[PDB]
Amino acid sequence: NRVRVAVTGAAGQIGYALVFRIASGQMFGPNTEVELNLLELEPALPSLEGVAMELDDCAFPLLKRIVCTADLNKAMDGVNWALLVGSVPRKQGMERSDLLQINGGIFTKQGQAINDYASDDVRVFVVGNPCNTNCLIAMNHAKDVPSDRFYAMTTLDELRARTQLAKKAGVDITAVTQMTIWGNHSATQYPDFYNAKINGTSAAQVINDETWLKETFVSTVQQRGAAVIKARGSSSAASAANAIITGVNHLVTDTPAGESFSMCRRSKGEYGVDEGLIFSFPCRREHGELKVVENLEFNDFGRERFNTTLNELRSERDTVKSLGLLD
């Protein structure tokens, strides 16, 4: 039980908040050794070496090897998990298609390096934005990697929604279960307050404030990242890193009875989601297999929010297809 993990953008704020908790055992468990393969762009390699010195200076018993490189093939060589954290943010003068085009190029290459160099059992966990469509592009460039190995992260959205529900109901965080973020990791995400539970009962019914749930709770969750930037003065790196730890942990440990978690994955057609889209679904891990929770119901309000986010993901797919990013 040793896991080799690539982390891209490894000298950035998320990576800096992430790698120490990984090495401490929190992602894969207290008896699983870890090898960290850390990738950066060439100009950031000196900073990365400083990060590696700090990892060494923690004397982590589980940390068995550190690789620091700007060579993508070296970073992916024999990895069992690829955490695709790094991406290109929107910059001055970019159009939306420009952002998809730039990140598409990057994730085409990362998918192909994963295909040609990662371990046969590799799983891929995409964080950098736009993460659903970046994941779609990487998946489509890894022909030899099964498509059910590709994930994108809505865990941060989910944990933010869980706290907002627990705060509003004045209950302990552990009284919230089955929090589902449907669709895209974006402002069109649907945080489903009907199927989420508070003390085993529909959160909508416990909170009993339709106005607050539809007009404050949903927008608060959708806009929470922007609110942290405004308050703290930089990105929400530590809570993002926590969400990576939590989401990968969800994929490698069986889900306690009564719970479920949000995860973007390749749709097999569940809930009418176009086959092959990367889409956030409710999931459970049972007997070591990932399953989509079936038979959750919607009202008209929910079908509306569901179709809005599905249509955004369709539009992004059609756009990157048009740019020649899907072969």
Next chain:
Amino acid sequence: NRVRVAVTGAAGQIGYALVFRIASGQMFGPNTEVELNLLELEPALPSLEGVAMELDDCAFPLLKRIVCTADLNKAMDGVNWALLVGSVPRKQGMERSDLLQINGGIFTKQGQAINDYASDDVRVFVVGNPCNTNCLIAMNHAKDVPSDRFYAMTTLDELRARTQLAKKAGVDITAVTQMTIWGNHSATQYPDFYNAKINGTSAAQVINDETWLKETFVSTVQQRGAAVIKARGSSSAASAANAIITGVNHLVTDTPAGESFSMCRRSKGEYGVDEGLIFSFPCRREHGELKVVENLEFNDFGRERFNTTLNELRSERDTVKSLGLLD
């Protein structure tokens, strides 16, 4: 099964890397609920509210309360641990005297606030530099708190030394035991490679390069903080946060057989160290009580290093006494 912890400087880089790992249960254990009292200077309060938003967005089951304040007395009210991280760093033009003076005034007030507001069982763990003497000053301004409640951190020095020994000997980190950093958290510290062990044998007998041990090894540990800054560009925040996790954990859990850990504490006279000085000693926690490891031996080389760092701590004490910081 609930601990209330004050963290000063809580929006700084060390605090930002530290509070999430505390909230996840790594400092006090998986079954110990935590209340975080976070202190900052007034201009940094808005940024601290952003840190609290991120803590909330982690949905930590153990995190039961967050307080954000610039009121020192509010921060210390009823706390069981006071993690004194915040301090003024050395900047352009500052001498050692100025660093001792500026931070001395801060820790006078922090000690007095712990004395008058913290819980009866409070323990104090000083990180901000100069940490030994800042701890001495706080302890001297907390007349009602027993002197054996005051600690300062050489844990980062110690873990850095462990990794250098393991790297040189080509052994896993867990093969190194009983790493003692004697004296001051400063460049006069004595990392004792004679009493440290590799697979149970004196490191000085396993690593046969006597010149490497006396020149390269000792200097590398003493100058490691500067080297990380040169490499990363910023301070070693995440590894310092890890050392705080590890050091406090050493003080709340019994030490495994065959190990020991470095801890600055109030001298009772052990090893000829003047009563009342805060000095880094080899320690074990046995059946819930902290004990100094006694009867460790020195050669002539080690005696000189020991005397150098003792005299530096005497010099620092005399300086802040001269400044009027001990009343």
